[PDB]
Amino acid sequence: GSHGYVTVKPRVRLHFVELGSGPAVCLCHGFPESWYSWRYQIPALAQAGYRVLAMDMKGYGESSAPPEIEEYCMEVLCKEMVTFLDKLGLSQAVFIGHDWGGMLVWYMALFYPERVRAVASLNTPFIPANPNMSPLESIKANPVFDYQLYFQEPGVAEAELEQNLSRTFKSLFRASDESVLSMHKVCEAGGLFVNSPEEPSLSRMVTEEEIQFYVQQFKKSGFRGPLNWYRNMERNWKWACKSLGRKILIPALMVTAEKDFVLVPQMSQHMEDWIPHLKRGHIEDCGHWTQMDKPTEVNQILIKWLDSDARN
Amino acid sequence: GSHGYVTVKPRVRLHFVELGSGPAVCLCHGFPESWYSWRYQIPALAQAGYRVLAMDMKGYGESSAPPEIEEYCMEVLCKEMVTFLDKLGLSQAVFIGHDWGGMLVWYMALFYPERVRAVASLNTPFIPANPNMSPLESIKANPVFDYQLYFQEPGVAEAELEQNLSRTFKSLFRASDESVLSMHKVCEAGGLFVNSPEEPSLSRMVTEEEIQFYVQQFKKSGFRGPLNWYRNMERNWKWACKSLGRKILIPALMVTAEKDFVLVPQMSQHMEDWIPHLKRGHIEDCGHWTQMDKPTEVNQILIKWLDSDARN
Ligand SMILES: CNc1nc(C)nc(N2CCC(C(=O)NCc3ccccc3C(F)(F)F)CC2)n1
Numbered sequence: 125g126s127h128g129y130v131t132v133k134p135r136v137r138l139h140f141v142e143l144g145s146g147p148a149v150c151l152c153h154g155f156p157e158s159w160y161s162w163r164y165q166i167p168a169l170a171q172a173g174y175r176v177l178a179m180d181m182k183g184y185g186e187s188s189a190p191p192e193i194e195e196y197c198m199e200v201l202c203k204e205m206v207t208f209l210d211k212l213g214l215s216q217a218v219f220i221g222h223d224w225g226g227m228l229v230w231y232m233a234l235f236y237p238e239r240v241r242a243v244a245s246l247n248t249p250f251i252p253a254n255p256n257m258s259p260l261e262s263i264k265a266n267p268v269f270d271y272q273l274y275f276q277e278p279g280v281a282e283a284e285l286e287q288n289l290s291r292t293f294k295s296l297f298r299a300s301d302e303s304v305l306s307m308h309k310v311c312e313a314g315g316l317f318v319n320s321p322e323e324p325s326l327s328r329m330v331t332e333e334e335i336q337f338y339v340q341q342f343k344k345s346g347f348r349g350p351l352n353w354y355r356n357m358e359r360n361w362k363w364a365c366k367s368l369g370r371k372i373l374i375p376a377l378m379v380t381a382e383k384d385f386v387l388v389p390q391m392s393q394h395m396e397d398w399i400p401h402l403k404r405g406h407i408e409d410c411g412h413w414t415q416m417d418k419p420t421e422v423n424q425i426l427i428k429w430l431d432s433d434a435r436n
Numbered sequence: 437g438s439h440g441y442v443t444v445k446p447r448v449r450l451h452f453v454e455l456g457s458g459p460a461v462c463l464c465h466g467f468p469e470s471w472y473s474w475r476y477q478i479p480a481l482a483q484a485g486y487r488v489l490a491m492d493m494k495g496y497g498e499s500s501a502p503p504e505i506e507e508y509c510m511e512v513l514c515k516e517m518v519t520f521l522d523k524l525g526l527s528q529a530v531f532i533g534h535d536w537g538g539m540l541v542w543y544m545a546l547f548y549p550e551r552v553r554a555v556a557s558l559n560t561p562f563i564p565a566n567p568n569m570s571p572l573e574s575i576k577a578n579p580v581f582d583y584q585l586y587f588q589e590p591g592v593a594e595a596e597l598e599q600n601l602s603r604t605f606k607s608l609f610r611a612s613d614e615s616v617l618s619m620h621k622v623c624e625a626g627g628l629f630v631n632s633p634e635e636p637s638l639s640r641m642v643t644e645e646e647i648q649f650y651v652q653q654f655k656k657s658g659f660r661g662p663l664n665w666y667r668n669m670e671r672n673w674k675w676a677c678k679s680l681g682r683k684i685l686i687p688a689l690m691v692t693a694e695k696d697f698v699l700v701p702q703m704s705q706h707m708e709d710w711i712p713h714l715k716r717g718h719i720e721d722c723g724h725w726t727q728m729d730k731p732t733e734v735n736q737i738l739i740k741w742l743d744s745d746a747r748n
């Protein structure tokens with residue numbers, strides 16, 4: 125891979141790993157991850173005939189990580205990704221996201237369809253903003269997203285996640301059957317790791333060397349930037365409401381994971397109302413950490429879609 | 437543009453500026469220049485439908501600049517450029533060079549045709565190595581390349597070129613009719629700038645801001661790395677002789693400049709013997725600094741060739 129750096133603002137520089145030739149495919153990771161979360165996809169997509177740009181998203185890795193909350197609202201993040209394309213001299217790119225990156229790519233497709241050739245999300249569904257319900261009332265109706273309330277107070281989740289980096293990543297990056305964390309009980313317990321092992325075992329999904337890569341990446345900036353993605357609920361809601369009723373008409377793929385107990389497949393059930401020609405993939409025995417849980421399946425699904433529906 | 441960095445060896449990292457989408461086109465500058473020497477070509481080639489990778493060559497700018505002479509022999513430089521393609525996941529690229537970069541791209545085409553889609557040189561002709569004549573005897577037969585003897589002794593040309601950076605670049609980067617330097621008299625005079633103005637005027641080719649960009653680039657590493665390109669005559673000759681008699685059969689373009697009084701058009705007259713299907717461009721009223729002297733003409737020639745002969 126090549127390490128690429130794009131200055132989108134005087135103080136904001138975005139880093140990416142680049143491999144391959146062909147149509148541009150921009151990969152956008154989730155929380156709390158890395159370009160490295162795409163390690164299995166990058167060579168496979170390149171081999172398939174694509175130019176891969178695997179991002180360190182704003183706040184992560186070698187990308188800029190300002191402390192200000194407003195720097196991580198979806199409107200700003202998407203605008204920067206447009207400038208990213210501008211600086212690279214790209215008219216369009218395919219955008220593939222997972223988790224928080226999945227949310228970003230949906231809004232890229234929604235607000236900047238002229239710059240998005242095609243869009244794919246792993247796990248993260250597209251649910252249009254509800255102008256009659258505040259972001260807090262949407263959690264008040266969904267006990268599943270309550271852990272995000274714990275992420276609200278600045279400094280709190282930062283301290284817990286940064287206390288022991290190895291423990292953090294070993295505790296998070298696990299297959300569903302290996303889970304040591306209860307996401308539906310976080311805010312009541314006052315932490316992610318209060319009731320989980322002090323020295324967690326290594327998941328079948330990852331090697332020690334892979335965990336240590338994440339550790340080193342988060343030694344650089346910590347979790348403030350990453351957590352700030354959660355702290356713009358009102359701003360993101362207000363921006364999203366400006367696009368009420370509009371449909372996504374560019375080629376689109378939604379990939380669900382059977383064993384993601386937070387981003388459940390059922391959450392995606394109404395997407396066709398807003399994305400008429402949506403295509404779908406579904407991975408059995410797959411938890412939240414899709415790319416590393418089922419890399420072979422992810423590669424198969426993405427390549428099939430890129431070579432067919434995504435082309436015009 | 438995007439700033440890209442490719443690690444080709446533990447201690448050698450190559451920098452490039454990247455713009456556009458389409459077939460990969462690698463631009464290789466001369467001495468003593470910069471990726472910035474391609475400033476007029478980068479947007480034009482990108483607009484034409486090409487993915488441009490404008491190098492800082494080894495020894496220059498943001499690329500690694502080790503002090504060792506052997507690090508800059510053509511064999512090593514070319515091998516690194518192959519590894520460069522490998523790291524980027526590129527099977528092939530078009531290679532376009534000027535000056536020392538022109539020499540490099542010819543040897544890329546000669547020794548690695550499977551990795552070079554097409555090859556173009558500005559000013560620098562392809563003359564097969566003569567196994568019956570030492571590199572020194574080739575200068576003894578050509579009073580035009582005598583200035584290169586001044587570049588041989590380590591430290592000497594470094595000191596002169598680094599003494600006053602603004603003076604250096606203002607003295608060098610001039611149209612032929614603005615010349616303040618006598619290249620055929622350098623080694624006898626004991627320097628490039630001994631008889632040239634202390635405070636040279638600004639050439640019509642460049643602005644003050646453009647000169648200052650070069651100044652800042654060479655503040656970083658100086659001229660040792662760049663000058664080391666000249667200090668491998670024997671090594672380069674021995675390597676080149678291994679390819680005696682072999683022809684370049686990939687698409688090829690030679691662009692000559694009427695007023696380059698060192699790399700004269702006539703030097704290229706026999707190239708068809710070794711490159712049967714060579715295509716040609718010729719720029720009138722054009723000195724050594726081709727890209728900045730006649731940017732419109734260079735763009736026209738390169739795009740015409742890239743869109744026709746270079747394709748298969
Ligand atoms: C606008 N609200 C909204 N709505 C939906 C349907 N999704 C999302 N997002 C953003 C937040 C994101 C998230 O919290 N990731 C982290 C995480 C997901 C799962 C399991 C453990 C974890 C954790 F926290 F442990 F890393 C999940 C996708 N946001």
Ligand SMILES: CNc1nc(C)nc(N2CCC(C(=O)NCc3ccccc3C(F)(F)F)CC2)n1
Pocket residue numbers: 466467468535536539560561563584608619698699703724
């Ligand atoms: C193997 N020998 C060989 N043979 C040929 C035909 N060309 C070359 N090269 C490499 C050296 C390169 C060079 O000296 N550039 C600098 C320069 C060129 C012009 C006018 C001023 C200057 C200078 F020195 F002022 F920058 C010219 C092309 N080498």
